[PDB]
């Protein structure tokens, strides 16, 4: 009826859905009502918006695993739901990268930041990030189609367009963000040890390594199995293992969304006091 990997993936997906929805709703409501839109909380509000959207769309895929396919909805949902999910995930990733870039810029150029780091520029950059995410996640909307071709419904799309889209997906959504984040945080911590940061280099280094480790361990299995499935044909033990662990990889990539608010938005001591008082 099932496999232990599948049931574990379903359970962790449900737990992630509950925890991430609760946390993201709390932080988004607090930032949108009880807090102002400063130059610093603008990134976190956008980041938790994408994460909340990804968390909210997660149970739809959880039900799909429970139903073992057999698309009950229509063609419009079969075309739109994957696009929404991928757009939310990539918006979250690119917003993490943008936050890292902003953190690097507010340290390596304080003079420039005091002039041109207005709130409007922050919304402009966030909007450009969302536009990039939409442009990258359009192809899943375009190439997805609803078919039956059997006694059961099937929602589908090795095909060359699939290969091209998965390679560009891997590159843009995992390698450039990871490289940019690592380079920026390493440059920050290299600046900290020099001077004037004696009080720092204890919280900052720990936060940086925790964030990078969490992001890396959360996004490595996803594209790892994505590449293995493309490079290894089915009807093999390795292919069967990849298929079995693909659901776990998806669950972990979605769990990154739940982890994000507890590492970025909840990190602020001032925000934590605000959240506790408003709780």
């Amino acid at each position: 009826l099932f496999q232990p990997q599948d049931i574990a993936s379903m359970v962790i997906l449900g737990l992630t859905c509950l925890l991430g929805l609760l946390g993201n709703g709390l932080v988004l409501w607090v930032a949108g009502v009880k807090m102002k839109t400063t130059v610093n909380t603008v990134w976190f509000l956008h980041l938790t918006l994408a994460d909340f959207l990804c968390c909210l769309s997660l149970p739809f895929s959880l039900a799909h695993l429970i139903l073992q396919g057999h698309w009950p909805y229509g063609l419009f949902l079969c075309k739109l739901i994957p696009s929404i999910i991928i757009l939310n995930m990539f918006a979250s990733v690119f917003l993490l990268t943008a936050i890292s870039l902003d953190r690097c810029l507010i340290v390596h150029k304080p003079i420039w930041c005091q002039n041109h780091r207005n709130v409007r520029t922050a919304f402009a950059i966030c909007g450009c990030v969302w536009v990039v995410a939409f442009v990258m996640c359009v192809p899943v909307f375009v190439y997805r189609d609803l078919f039956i071709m059997d006694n059961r419904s099937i929602c589908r799309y090795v095909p060359t367009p699939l290969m091209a889209i998965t390679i560009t997906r891997l590159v843009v959504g995992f390698l450039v963000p990871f490289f940019i984040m690592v380079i920026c945080y390493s440059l920050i911590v290299f600046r900290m040890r020099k001077t004037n940061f004696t009080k720092s280099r204890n919280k900052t280094f720990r936060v940086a390594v925790a964030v990078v480790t969490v992001f890396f361990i959360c996004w490595t299995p996803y594209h790892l199995v994505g590449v293995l499935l493309l490079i290894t044909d089915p009807e093999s033990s390795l292919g069967e293992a990849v298929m079995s662990w693909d659901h776990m990889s998806i669950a972990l990539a979605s769990a990154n969304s739940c982890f994000n608010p507890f590492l970025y938005a909840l990190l602020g001591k001032d925000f934590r006091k605000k959240a506790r008082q408003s709780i």
């Binding site: 599948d6 739809f60 895929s61 799909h64 695993l65 073992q68 396919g69 057999h70 739901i81 994957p82 999910i85 991928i86 995930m89 099937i154 929602c155 589908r156 998965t166 996803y222 994505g226 089915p234 069967e240 298929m243 079995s244 693909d246 659901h247 998806i250 990539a253 979605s254």
Partner: peptide, 12 residues
């Protein structure tokens, strides 16, 4: 293995 082929998470 046909059922194992049917499952496909909505993120690929």
């Amino acid at each position: 293995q046909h059922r194992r082929d049917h499952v496909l998470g909505l993120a690929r």
